[PDB]
């Protein structure tokens, strides 16, 4: 069983996002007090705050790390319709490197791309637009270019890249919505990049999901030949995507997939808020409105069963 | 109380100012080219009479601020852009209800205000840097207050006091004045960094004044003491244009911005970080906001530059706090789980705080231990298989040890066909790679070598190699990562290590580059690689400092710097500061 | 070494020993003394450690903190011209006896003794 340890954050408002770094030794927390804090652990195991600087003018929703090969880089999305890219410079000073302001509505989420694709960033706003920025020169973070923009016809709430590093899978991004209109429309759409046309195109759509979606997450591939996706809603859903063999006609359209749902859990008896995978993509952690965290794993017969329940305090 | 529903109407010209009567039945709207009064019914509003009478345009017609007298229901005042103030009397039977004109100002009159009780006193602040008082008794009404500052933006009477008013200036200063002593001001203080655009007294409190400027912050000031004290500060997303206390609520204020943003906000000062309510009806920049009835907190009125004026109901506003995500969750490389949740879900308002916890396991040490002691080359196949099997059995992974032993039996030898077991080996590799155990598959692939290399396509091999290398780098095991890269069977992975790892060195005496296989300068004929400590020629490893351009043998320099903090060449540079 | 320090402190006329210096591949200028891992002149990336695959670099200008630890200095084999960080290569040659770059046969640490 796990052992709990409380941390005194001293945030003047709600803590919205917590994210670990690449090496699992540093943590970043962004809150609604327009503040971001960085925590480092010591030999004793205690966590100490090492930086606390005001970043934006409105609430800060999401903050994420970049791969260490490019340096200590953070990206944050705010309610003031902006995204910011910060860097650490040597004491430890965090300096704003770039600001992206192309959005006209609240920026809902921001996430980095997998390393093998370069230094790319993806931001989804509340108006239903997902933009992809790229830095051609990794040594100059002050300049960025807008590569692609996609319209989803519905307000966006979360995005996720496909972390597969194989050369047989084109880059994929999944976008979820949190609309509550009475019309039972689709909520999860998956786009794929086409090398020939150099454009992202709609590839798949999950018609069985009609409730508002609060979070989605791909699972780390790490050698598999298909994809696993996890969706958080009034319940927890897990889907598997197996690409089909490409026809000899060599069609230039998006790759076709076979979609199956392999697990649907509703043990939280409430709105499930967050989902997250472990490092190896074998254990799923879900946190809902009950105030408890649940862990899920699958046996060798592909049956997903709960393995642990954790309670605060 | 007043009854109705949210309802919008379209004007013919952009609107710059709106005002309300005492009966909450008619609202006057004025702008650059619009001047009309409207009666709002339970279904919609309808114009009653426009003040744009006469086809001849006038500079006095371009009004920027209009106020409805709170004492008489037939008195209106307008401040034109030509530096003039016009009075309008609805009681006059003439179509042109203009009554009196005062051209005292020379610059644009920014704000005009009435007196709550006196129906014959008006105040005007203009761009001239002066403030003018006017008596409607048609007597000698000239009374000029010189603030000795930038242009005046807002001027307002107090509600409790009869003679006291306040003024804001574009320099960022607020002056409290009295009408009985025009000789000098009573209070003066810098409220904001930059110009201040709006101010308002608290409808119930007797010493609270709220101010707002371009600094995107609205702060409440207390005036009871000799020195004004700041109580609450709220940050918006744009330059704050106008602020109005909500009636019947002691800690609620509505705010409208001036640029960039179009939405109207309702804030509670006790929670200064998220808006209490939001209105997003308008599409252009909001210009005028006003509470309908001084004792009805239910309805609001707002006119914008899109020639649209709308009445909003508080219950119809959007609540961001009701739909905010209240939890954060993340995993760590060592099996740690970080979880931050709202205080209410775990156990003025207890919903404004959160608790952060980390859960730890008493998690994947077998991975590190296996990666550190496996053997991959330098010995015959049987020895490698036996060593790996023993190592696996040490950690309790019996099946892996059995797999290693069976591999040794299969390969390290009236016989079976020469390639009887190829399919089984390929399927075993796939099986071990399909469950995230890339380590075993990569180790087997490296050990077997060419005996199985041709049965697996290159893409899958590259995928496995990259995944294993990424995991090793995550756990910060550089030796094993480089060992895997060196012994890789894939061309790309083998070439991954040779990208820009060659250094160019030149002698500092002749400034010429040196060859790649010698230690003597071609032109200087000097041993350019003499260790600074032992004064011998260095053939192999050389450590160099970027500061003083000195160095030498790796171990010599390391040991020397363990004992002192000076460049051993005697240059004075502290190469490892402190 | 102590005598040399003393003499250099007292006598400014003495010129310290001359040794080698590193040069940028593109600009060709010295890199001795704006991200740290960039050439001061051309702003192009510097060589990268053969083990950590990260570009090398060091900030340039008593019971205090140390700006540039010894473990992050440049190290290279004077024959094979391959190199990286001090600590990484120290560990690698403590456990192995060959140049860490692929297709290199230099026994770099055995040359000096
Ligand atoms: Zn020379
Ligand atoms: Zn030496
Ligand atoms: Zn030196
Ligand atoms: Zn030095
Ligand atoms: Zn250069
Ligand atoms: Zn070498
Ligand atoms: Zn060498
Ligand atoms: Zn290194």
Short mmCIF file of C-alpha atoms in Angstrom, two decimals, chain B residues 473 478-483 485-486 493-509 511-512 514-519 526-532 535 537-555 557-558 560-561 564 566-572 575-578, chain C residues 1-2 4-5 8 16-25 28 31-33 46-54 56-71 73-84 86 88-96 98-104 108-109 111-112:
data_model
loop_
_atom_site.label_atom_id
_atom_site.label_comp_id
_atom_site.label_asym_id
_atom_site.label_seq_id
_atom_site.Cartn_x
_atom_site.Cartn_y
_atom_site.Cartn_z
CA UNK B 473 18.27 7.98 -20.11
CA UNK B 478 24.61 6.70 -19.28
CA UNK B 479 27.10 3.83 -19.34
CA UNK B 480 24.45 1.25 -20.22
CA UNK B 481 22.90 3.56 -22.83
CA UNK B 482 26.22 4.09 -24.60
CA UNK B 483 26.97 0.37 -24.34
CA UNK B 485 24.40 2.21 -28.76
CA UNK B 486 27.87 0.82 -29.50
CA UNK B 493 21.14 3.56 -33.84
CA UNK B 494 24.84 2.89 -34.38
CA UNK B 495 25.27 6.25 -36.11
CA UNK B 496 23.30 8.05 -33.38
CA UNK B 497 26.47 8.44 -31.31
CA UNK B 498 28.72 10.11 -33.92
CA UNK B 499 26.81 13.38 -34.43
CA UNK B 500 29.13 16.33 -33.72
CA UNK B 501 31.35 14.87 -31.00
CA UNK B 502 34.70 15.98 -32.46
CA UNK B 503 36.61 18.93 -31.03
CA UNK B 504 38.99 21.33 -32.77
CA UNK B 505 42.04 22.52 -30.83
CA UNK B 506 44.66 25.15 -31.65
CA UNK B 507 47.92 26.20 -30.04
CA UNK B 508 47.51 29.47 -28.16
CA UNK B 509 51.03 30.60 -29.10
CA UNK B 511 47.12 30.45 -33.08
CA UNK B 512 47.24 27.72 -35.69
CA UNK B 514 46.87 21.30 -34.87
CA UNK B 515 46.79 17.88 -36.49
CA UNK B 516 44.64 15.02 -35.21
CA UNK B 517 47.42 12.50 -34.48
CA UNK B 518 50.21 14.58 -32.95
CA UNK B 519 51.05 16.55 -29.83
CA UNK B 526 56.49 23.27 -28.89
CA UNK B 527 54.75 20.72 -26.71
CA UNK B 528 51.38 22.47 -26.58
CA UNK B 529 49.86 19.71 -24.41
CA UNK B 530 52.10 19.87 -21.34
CA UNK B 531 50.16 19.23 -18.14
CA UNK B 532 50.06 22.27 -15.88
CA UNK B 535 54.88 19.27 -16.58
CA UNK B 537 53.45 15.71 -22.28
CA UNK B 538 49.83 14.52 -22.28
CA UNK B 539 48.96 11.83 -24.80
CA UNK B 540 45.48 10.71 -23.78
CA UNK B 541 42.76 12.41 -21.76
CA UNK B 542 42.99 16.18 -21.36
CA UNK B 543 40.70 18.33 -19.21
CA UNK B 544 40.42 22.01 -20.10
CA UNK B 545 38.92 25.07 -18.41
CA UNK B 546 36.86 27.51 -20.45
CA UNK B 547 37.87 30.48 -18.30
CA UNK B 548 41.67 30.62 -18.15
CA UNK B 549 42.37 28.25 -21.08
CA UNK B 550 44.44 25.97 -18.83
CA UNK B 551 44.24 22.29 -18.06
CA UNK B 552 46.08 19.01 -18.00
CA UNK B 553 45.71 15.41 -16.95
CA UNK B 554 42.24 14.49 -15.73
CA UNK B 555 43.27 12.98 -12.41
CA UNK B 557 43.64 18.46 -12.19
CA UNK B 558 40.86 16.78 -10.22
CA UNK B 560 44.62 19.58 -7.35
CA UNK B 561 41.21 21.25 -7.40
CA UNK B 564 42.69 24.43 -3.55
CA UNK B 566 43.39 28.41 -7.97
CA UNK B 567 44.43 27.72 -11.53
CA UNK B 568 47.54 25.54 -11.07
CA UNK B 569 49.23 27.41 -13.91
CA UNK B 570 49.26 30.46 -11.65
CA UNK B 571 47.02 32.76 -13.68
CA UNK B 572 44.85 33.95 -10.77
CA UNK B 575 38.23 28.32 -12.26
CA UNK B 576 35.62 26.75 -9.94
CA UNK B 577 34.44 29.91 -8.16
CA UNK B 578 34.46 29.30 -4.40
CA UNK C 1 52.45 25.24 -8.10
CA UNK C 2 52.29 27.24 -4.87
CA UNK C 4 54.20 29.76 -9.21
CA UNK C 5 51.08 31.31 -7.68
CA UNK C 8 52.63 35.45 -10.43
CA UNK C 16 51.91 32.07 -17.51
CA UNK C 17 52.31 28.86 -19.46
CA UNK C 18 50.82 28.62 -22.95
CA UNK C 19 48.56 25.69 -23.82
CA UNK C 20 45.84 24.73 -26.30
CA UNK C 21 42.38 26.22 -26.76
CA UNK C 22 39.13 25.07 -28.35
CA UNK C 23 37.76 26.58 -31.56
CA UNK C 24 34.28 26.68 -33.04
CA UNK C 25 33.70 24.51 -36.09
CA UNK C 28 36.70 29.23 -36.24
CA UNK C 31 35.22 29.90 -27.47
CA UNK C 32 37.08 31.06 -24.37
CA UNK C 33 36.15 34.21 -22.49
CA UNK C 46 28.69 23.65 -29.42
CA UNK C 47 29.85 20.02 -29.52
CA UNK C 48 27.89 17.55 -27.43
CA UNK C 49 28.95 15.06 -24.77
CA UNK C 50 29.40 11.60 -26.26
CA UNK C 51 27.54 10.03 -23.32
CA UNK C 52 24.73 12.40 -22.31
CA UNK C 53 24.15 13.61 -25.91
CA UNK C 54 23.73 17.16 -24.57
CA UNK C 56 28.51 21.13 -23.60
CA UNK C 57 28.93 24.59 -22.13
CA UNK C 58 29.87 26.57 -19.04
CA UNK C 59 28.81 29.99 -17.70
CA UNK C 60 31.47 32.67 -18.17
CA UNK C 61 32.01 36.05 -16.54
CA UNK C 62 34.38 31.21 0.30
CA UNK C 63 31.52 29.06 1.62
CA UNK C 64 29.37 30.10 -1.36
CA UNK C 65 27.87 28.25 -4.30
CA UNK C 66 29.98 27.12 -7.25
CA UNK C 67 28.97 28.35 -10.70
CA UNK C 68 31.01 25.89 -12.78
CA UNK C 69 31.56 22.54 -11.11
CA UNK C 70 34.51 20.41 -12.15
CA UNK C 71 32.16 17.72 -13.46
CA UNK C 73 34.34 20.86 -17.90
CA UNK C 74 35.53 19.91 -21.36
CA UNK C 75 37.49 16.68 -21.62
CA UNK C 76 38.83 15.04 -24.75
CA UNK C 77 41.22 12.34 -25.91
CA UNK C 78 44.20 14.05 -27.47
CA UNK C 79 44.53 11.28 -30.07
CA UNK C 80 40.99 10.26 -31.03
CA UNK C 81 39.67 13.84 -30.57
CA UNK C 82 36.47 12.51 -28.97
CA UNK C 83 35.32 13.93 -25.68
CA UNK C 84 32.60 15.18 -23.40
CA UNK C 86 34.44 15.30 -17.10
CA UNK C 88 30.65 11.09 -17.58
CA UNK C 89 33.93 10.16 -19.25
CA UNK C 90 35.61 9.61 -15.88
CA UNK C 91 32.99 7.00 -14.98
CA UNK C 92 33.00 5.43 -18.44
CA UNK C 93 36.77 4.96 -18.46
CA UNK C 94 36.64 3.73 -14.88
CA UNK C 95 34.41 0.88 -16.05
CA UNK C 96 35.67 0.45 -19.65
CA UNK C 98 37.80 2.01 -25.13
CA UNK C 99 36.75 5.29 -26.71
CA UNK C 100 32.99 5.64 -26.13
CA UNK C 101 32.30 6.76 -29.70
CA UNK C 102 31.20 4.07 -32.13
CA UNK C 103 33.88 2.69 -34.47
CA UNK C 104 36.77 4.09 -32.43
CA UNK C 108 42.53 6.67 -24.60
CA UNK C 109 43.24 6.34 -20.89
CA UNK C 111 48.12 6.05 -23.49
CA UNK C 112 49.26 8.25 -20.60
#
